[PDB]
Design a protein around this ligand. Structure first.
Ligand SMILES: *[C@@H]1O[C@H](CO)[C@@H](O[C@@H]2O[C@H](CO)[C@@H](O[C@@H]3O[C@H](CO[C@H]4O[C@H](CO)[C@@H](O)[C@H](O)[C@@H]4O)[C@@H](O)[C@H](O[C@H]4O[C@H](CO)[C@@H](O)[C@H](O)[C@@H]4O)[C@@H]3O)[C@H](O)[C@H]2NC(C)=O)[C@H](O[C@H]2O[C@@H](C)[C@@H](O)[C@@H](O)[C@@H]2O)[C@H]1NC(C)=O
Ligand SMILES: C[C@@H]([C@H](O)c1ccc(O)cc1)N1CCC(Cc2ccccc2)CC1
Ligand SMILES: C[C@@H]([C@H](O)c1ccc(O)cc1)N1CCC(Cc2ccccc2)CC1
Ligand SMILES: *[C@@H]1O[C@H](CO)[C@@H](O)[C@H](O)[C@H]1NC(C)=O
Ligand SMILES: *[C@H]1O[C@H](CO)[C@@H](O)[C@H](O)[C@H]1NC(C)=O
Ligand SMILES: *[C@H]1O[C@H](CO)[C@@H](O)[C@H](O)[C@H]1NC(C)=O
Ligand SMILES: *[C@H]1O[C@H](CO)[C@@H](O)[C@H](O)[C@H]1NC(C)=O
Ligand SMILES: *[C@H]1O[C@H](CO)[C@@H](O)[C@H](O)[C@H]1NC(C)=O
Ligand code: NA
Lengths: 345, 355, 353
């Protein structure tokens, strides 16, 4: 049997480098290019590709740093009960609290694992004293609680000084944020927010003298984002946790995302059927189920499984340092660090 | 004017429809047709079983066909058999070899000009006497076709004897278990009946257990040296191909000749009624259906393009001819034919497994 | 609560008024049907299915045509729609339904009727008998069920003959006659269709096997409609029968609608979904990756109003209430026994003449 799979590619993409089945179904892949990334564009393109070929799944890659894409895909996925894999760019920026009916999964570590790593980098170089700074970006609570529950377990004698919550949904005329930042004493600051948010926070921090020697910021994957795009406001010496395009390229990912969806075999081989792709986005719900998820989650190819939360169980993480020459440099692997004495940055 | 008697057919292509039309035209020419004359009525296969049944009704039974020729398209003959059997209008299968069509409970008025797979047992048996294989292990798939081949060969054996019959669940990919049970037995002649994909599973396991070399004989059917079953088949295997078994043109020619003969023989009798015109509102069987079937079942056509045409008690073709094929240096080589009743070895030498 | 479409198809004179009286709720629609050949039945269902969203089908008819059961089974398997044959030919037991059938019938299985027959024999100490069948599907189930009940009993059963009759050929060679003239037993179990039985009986009489000294016992589908008695049926004929007496059409349609509705409910409330009714029969080849047998597991085990209305996988009823009938001298069918829960209770101690 044949199942249709749309691979959507936003912006620059080597479509030639991108292009088997012993399984019970065969992927009829179609490589689709999309120009814009606003809600209408993404919704309009996916719905129409569905009111054409019968799409059993979507594999989605963009170049942009727009973490909103993930949110737009979760919504589209939950509304049409179509599996969607966010494998690269904004679509892979971890989405916290995906919809219950969501069939959206992303390549990348959970917020909780990224926090687990950061404390590991910390233990490595004996950085036991710190602060946290989040905005309200979803997952901020996931982040803080994982840090807080880890410390309490520990005899390592951590000391969390301040935890700040920055409301980035208002303007900064009162210079409220400047004042919240002025409260920070600690030498290590863990920051959780979006890339575009971080660029603002850093500027305000460079103004209050918190970005030089003696203040080290550690930042999750979605802040670093695309490493070939470095905002001038990022403090030299920025430590991030990225999802490496260095050992796991787009074509590898895109192949693996088709191996995930081509799930369908498992469910066919056990229930002698697969869900009929939403002929349209103009609906008739007592008919569609969530059944495919159970299978999209346990795919073993050459262990590609997920959590029901929608993130990879076993992602390879590279620790990166933004250096003086202002390129992102690989200084660790997830924990094995290049350095034994942390260099002055 | 003569009485026009329609014969129907569900065939593969418009080309084969034209062959059917031409076979009937010739039957008219060669027969005395003052009293009764045949007319050809045909369609090609529908995309699914429900549409096919409906086509039978709207296109064929609507024309009062005395009989319906049916081939395997390029989706089985079943909907055609059920619909036609509802009225006891005989169906002549031209190319299906599945044994299930030999079952009178399900296929009430079905005859075919090719033998069912399981009849390959007749050749194996003749082969066992010839090369004096008195002790054999039978390996069959545990589905209808596997069991048919077993019943059929056990019948012929009850001389040479089967030491054990092993059966395996179709679709099972590791048969190391099954095959180790047969390695432990003494007898080294192994007969196999399985679909293509199951033969592949057996051949592999067989090989990994090194049961495919010198000393071992493998005797098989057509499905087991076809398509994919060939990709992993051991060398020195002996297999079969039904001569003309796939020639729709030849079988149309012969079926029409047998049927024309039977029609004329039928009208030499009295109180022959016509079939129902159409399906709608007709629920009684065609009263002459069972008699037309009896005449057909006992028809005998000696000079057939596919050989000597007679039907056995299940309405299956008798006197079928087989190519005896041996896999030599990975090539299928004809080492002989079963000519209907006799094995005839040709000048090409059999190379056994090992050799 | 959401609504499932349930087509209820009535063939022949029927009282619709009397007839027309959970997480999901039924939207019934009574449809009449005039003909019972294959095109009429296939067509009416495929049309019914392309207008509404029929989730299940309740089928009743007023005939003795067992072919209807087979037509339905095929439809049910091709389109993966539940179909319930509750009455008539539609309920005449079909053996070996398709692997993917969702066809279920109100009535006792072939094997149970055969057991019931042996119970009748044991009660009146009729231990010596013979069997006659045609190739009608089920005949093996019938002959084997007898053979292994016999084999496993500390009772002096004696099976004298088993004849198999080929009704697909004409009988101008007098074959049937020459087989029948071999029977000696005073009891004869006949397994075949009603239309077949009338021919067999006509012949057995011409050979002196119908009268006194010979008792024929026959299954529900030979008796068929008890208001239609072929003249060739011998007086004194015994038959098992699904109790159309105390269990009338309007009751059966009730339970019909219940089973398709209960079943659907049970499956939304454990899977958060229900199989979507295919709107077309012309499209079932492509669309089949997306279709399933799934509802079978629920259709098979519905308790309703404290009655266990469940089915076997083979598609017959688990606990049918059966009635033993005897064809009297005035050629009307008379009730003479009940089979309840593996328990046979007869009316007479001494058997009637
Ligand atoms: C498949 O292969 C088999 C075996 O070769 C073949 O059957 C034989 O066919 C031949 C030729 O038709 C038959 O021959 C004549 O034999 C008789 C007497 O035979 C008896 O002894 C032999 C040998 O021990 C036994 O086998 C038989 O059972 C008998 O007991 C002989 O008198 C006769 O001769 C006169 O006629 C001759 C020409 O026919 C003429 O040359 C001569 O001067 C005489 O006037 C023949 O030589 C032979 O008996 C068959 N053997 C067996 C075992 O049955 C199959 O052939 C037939 O099919 C079609 C094509 C026709 O040719 C039929 O008449 C054959 O019966 C062959 N099948 C197919 C499908 O080709
Ligand atoms: C509310 C923000 C958000 O999550 C956030 C951003 C920054 C923060 O500091 C805190 C929260 N989102 C909402 C949804 C928007 C995308 C979208 C559009 C149409 C339909 C479905 C989804 C993308 C922006
Ligand atoms: C073959 C006989 C049958 O079972 C039988 C009857 C008497 C016997 O002595 C032995 C067998 N059937 C075959 C199928 C026919 C129904 C049908 C038609 C079209 C599509 C699907 C189904 C109805 C009659
Ligand atoms: C098939 O049979 C016909 C006889 O009508 C013949 O003309 C044709 O050559 C045959 N084709 C094959 C495959 O031998
Ligand atoms: C990309 O596709 C869009 C949609 O047609 C089109 O408007 C735009 O000009 C295209 N740009 C490129 C890179 O060709
Ligand atoms: C995945 O998980 C199931 C359920 O726990 C487990 O039993 C099974 O071994 C796994 N399936 C595969 C693809 O091996
Ligand atoms: C079918 O026949 C019956 C009996 O005469 C008739 O009452 C009924 O109306 C017919 N069907 C239609 C659509 O008229
Ligand atoms: C059928 O339904 C009953 C009643 O709820 C359930 O308890 C039981 O598990 C089912 N029976 C079967 C088929 O095992
Ligand atoms: Na037959």
């Amino acid at each position: 049997p044949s199942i249709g799979i749309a691979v959507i590619l936003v912006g620059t993409s080597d479509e030639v480098a991108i292009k088997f089945h012993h399984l019970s179904v065969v992927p009829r892949v179609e490589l689709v290019a999309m120009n814009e990334t606003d809600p209408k564009s993404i919704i309009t393109r996916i719905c129409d590709l569905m009111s054409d070929r019968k799409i059993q799944g979507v594999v989605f890659a963009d170049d942009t740093d727009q973490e909103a894409i993930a949110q737009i895909l979760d919504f589209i996925s939950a509304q049409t009960l179509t599996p969607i894999l966010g494998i690269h760019g904004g679509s892979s920026m971890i989405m916290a609290d995906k919809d219950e009916s969501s069939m959206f999964f992303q390549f990348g570590p959970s917020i909780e694992q990224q926090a687990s790593v950061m404390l590991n980098i910390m233990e490595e170089y004996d950085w036991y004293i710190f602060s946290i700074v989040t905005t309200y970006f979803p997952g901020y609570q996931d982040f803080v609680n994982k840090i807080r529950s880890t410390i309490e377990n520990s005899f390592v004698g951590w000391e969390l000084e301040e935890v700040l919550l920055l409301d980035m949904s208002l303007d900064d005329g009162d210079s409220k944020i400047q004042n919240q930042l002025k409260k920070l004493q600690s030498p290590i600051i863990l920051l959780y927010c979006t890339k575009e948010e971080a660029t603002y926070i850093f500027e305000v921090a460079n103004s209050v003298g918190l970005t030089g020697y003696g203040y080290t910021w550690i930042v999750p994957s979605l802040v670093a984002g695309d490493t070939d795009t470095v905002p001038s406001e990022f403090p030299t010496g920025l430590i991030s946790v990225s999802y490496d395009e260095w050992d796991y390229g787009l074509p590898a990912r895109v192949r693996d995302g088709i191996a995930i969806i081509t799930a369908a075999s498992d469910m066919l081989s056990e229930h002698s059927f697969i869900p009929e792709p939403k002929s349209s986005c103009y609906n008739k719900r007592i008919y569609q189920s969530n059944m495919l998820n159970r299978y999209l989650i346990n795919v073993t190819f050459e262990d590609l499984s997920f959590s029901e939360d929608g993130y990879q169980m076993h992602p390879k993480l590279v620790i990166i340092l933004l250096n003086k020459e202002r390129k992102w440099e690989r200084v660790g692997k997830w924990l094995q660090m290049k350095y034994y004495v942390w260099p002055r940055m | 004017d003569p009485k026009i008697v329609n014969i129907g057919a569900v065939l593969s292509t418009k080309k084969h429809e034209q062959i059917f039309r031409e076979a009937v035209n010739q039957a008219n020419k060669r027969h005395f047709t003052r009293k009764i004359q045949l007319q050809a009525t045909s369609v090609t296969h529908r995309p699914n079983a429900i549409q096919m049944a409906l086509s039978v009704c709207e296109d064929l039974i609507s024309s009062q066909v005395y009989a319906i020729l049916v081939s395997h398209p390029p989706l089985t003959p079943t909907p055609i058999s059920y619909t036609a059997g509802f009225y006891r209008i005989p169906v002549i299968g031209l190319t299906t070899r599945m044994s299930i069509y030999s079952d009178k409970s399900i296929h009430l008025s079905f005859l075919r000009t090719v033998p069912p797979y399981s009849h390959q047992a007749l050749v194996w048996f003749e082969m066992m006497r010839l090369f004096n294989w008195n002790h054999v292990i039978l390996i069959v798939s545990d589905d209808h076709e596997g069991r048919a081949a077993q019943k059929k060969l056990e019948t012929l054996l009850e001389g040479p004897k089967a030491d054990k019959v092993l059966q395996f669940e179709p679709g099972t990919k590791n048969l190391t278990a099954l095959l180790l049970e047969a390695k432990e037995l003494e007898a080294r002649v192994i007969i196999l009946s399985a679909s293509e994909d199951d033969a592949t599973a057996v051949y592999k396991s067989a090989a990994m257990l090194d049961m495919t070399g010198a000393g071992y004989v493998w005797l098989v059917g057509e499905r087991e040296i076809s398509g994919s079953a060939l990709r992993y088949a051991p060398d020195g295997i002996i297999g079969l191909q039904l001569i003309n078994g796939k020639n729709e043109s030849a079988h149309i020619s012969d079926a029409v000749a047998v049927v024309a003969q039977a029609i004329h023989e039928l009208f030499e009798m009295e109180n022959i009624t016509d079939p129902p015109r159409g399906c709608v509102g007709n629920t009684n069987i065609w009263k002459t259906g069972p008699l037309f079937k009896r005449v057909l079942m006992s028809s005998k056509y000696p000079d057939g393009v596919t050989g000597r045409i007679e039907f056995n008690e299940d309405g299956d073709r008798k006197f079928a001819q087989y190519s005896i094929m041996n896999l030599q240096n990975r090539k299928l080589v004809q080492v002989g034919i079963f000519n209907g009743s006799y094995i005839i070895q040709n000048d090409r030498k059999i190379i056994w497994p090992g050799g």
